[PDB]
Amino acid sequence: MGDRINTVRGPITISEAGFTLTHEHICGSSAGFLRAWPEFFGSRKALAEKAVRGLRRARAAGVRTIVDVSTFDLGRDVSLLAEVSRAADVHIVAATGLWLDPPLSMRLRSVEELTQFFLREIQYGIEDTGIRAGIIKVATTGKVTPFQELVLRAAARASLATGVPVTTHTAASQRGGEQQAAILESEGLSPSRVCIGHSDAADDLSYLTALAARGYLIGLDSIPHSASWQTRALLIKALIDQGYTKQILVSNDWLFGISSYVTNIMDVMDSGNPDGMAFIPLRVIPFLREKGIPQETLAGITVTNPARFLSPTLR
């Protein structure tokens, strides 16, 4: 809080975070799936070793902290997160919230009940681990459904109660952040607590600048998903040129295992981006400096902006 954020190894001071990737995943899965069917990923051991190798390579490239925005329904296994964080010596911030696959036991809950679930994971711990979430992740479809609106209100109330930020999954093509922002502001949530994710898939700079002008963080968090990735990277330069350097968060949205998709999509992605989570420091950062963006600006985006974002702020 304030001076410190929760990680899966415990609280760290904001200065320790360093180069932070604010939207990543160790595993994209489903609640209970890794523990019920680890051989889907070869084995749990095989999956953890893959994640440790990849995190160590991102660390070599300068990454010091990642935010795993896998929720309960993305199969978040915070014991796996802690194992790989410790072995890679990379800070991992865990998430609460709900993505696009809530089971019935979540889909039938009230906004008050969802609020208590998010407060439990932030304030008490996830499962029986004592590991606390440092961010609340919400996904909506283009047109926000009734249940998704409940999740956003619960996220806003939990963020207002704890100071931890909210990060969203959007369809940038449907300008979904505008619906999300309206709801979140209807609860009194400051835009400076909110990242509008998957924004690098947008064909509408005006949509991005208007949100940034309101104080939202712009998650250009899927750049290596292109990947033309050069065109998506230029959105970073575009927002810098308009005076919104401080509103930019950059990430890879990479994963080391995937079960919530057609089998073998992980291999396809690995042949496309062998850098994995190292893609931002190894490719995008030098691309931007080559375009004349000063080093101090890039340090602001990769260190200072996440630190201001992740630092529990306001109420």
- What is the Cα–Cα distance from 16 to 134, expressed in whole angstroms? 15
Is 23 annotated among the ligand-binding residues? yes
> Does 75 help bind its own copies (rule: CB under 8 A)?
yes
- Closest CB to its own copies among residues 75, 134: 75
Q: Beta partners for 97?
A: 137
Q: Alpha-carbon distance 183 to 253, whole Å? A: 25
Alpha carbon 254 to chain centroid, angstroms: 10
* Binding of residue 128 to its own copies (CB under 8 A): yes
What is the C-alpha to C-alpha distance for residues 79 and 90, in angstroms, rounded to an integer? Answer: 15
Nearer Cβ to its own copies, position 98 or 218? 98
Q: Which of 83, 101, 178, 270 binds its own copies (CB under 8 A)?
A: 101
Integer Cα distance of 130 and 120 in angstroms: 10
Select 261 or 299, whichever has its Cβ closest to its own copies: 261
Q: Is 148 in the site for its own copies (CB under 8 A)?
A: no
Check residue 239 for interaction with its own copies (CB under 8 A).
no
- The interface region with Zn ion, picked from 52-60, 90-98, 180-188, 249-257 by CB under 5 A, is 249-257
Name every residue whose Cβ is closer than 8 Å to that of residue 279 and which is 6 or more positions away in sequence: 223, 224, 227, 252, 254, 273
Q: Which is nearer to ligand CAC, 28 or 191 (CB)?
A: 28
Question: For Zn ion, which stretch binds (CB under 5 A), given 115-123, 169-177, 238-246, 270-278?
Answer: 169-177
Q: How far is the CB of 176 from ligand CAC (least distance, A)?
A: 12
148-187: which residues touch ligand CAC (CB under 6 A)?
A: 169
Could you tell which of its own copies, Zn ion, ligand CAC, none binds residue 35, using a CB distance below 5 to 8 A set by kind? its own copies
Contact between 224 and ligand CAC per CB under 6 A: no
198 is in an annotated binding site: yes
For residue 138, give both structure tokens.
């919400």
- Return the closest-CA partner of residue 191 out of 216, 168, 159, 167: 216
- Shortest spacing between CB 198 and Zn ion, in angstroms: 6
- The pairing of strands 10-13 and 4-7 is antiparallel
Distance of CA 98 to the CA centre of its chain: 12
The answer to whether the beta carbons of residues 180 and 170 sit under 8 Å apart is yes
Residue pair 158/118 in contact by the 8 Å Cβ criterion: yes
Residues in the chain: 315
Residue 91 labeled ligand binder: no
Whole-number Å distance between alpha carbons of 292 and 22: 24
* Contact by Cβ (8 Å): 53, 97: no
3-class state of residue 108 by DSSP: coil
| Given 253, 288, 297, 307, the residue binding Zn ion (CB under 5 A) | 253
Is residue 33 involved in binding its own copies (CB under 8 A)?
A: yes
Q: Which residues carry a binding-site annotation? A: 23, 25, 137, 169, 198, 253
- Site residues, ligand CAC (CB under 6 A): 28, 74, 169, 253
Q: Which residues carry a binding-site annotation for Zn(2+)? A: 23, 25, 137, 169, 198, 253
- Site residues, its own copies (CB under 8 A): 29-33, 35-37, 39-40, 72-73, 75, 101, 103-106, 108-110, 113, 116-117, 120-121, 126-128, 259-263
- Site residues, Zn ion (CB under 5 A): 169, 253
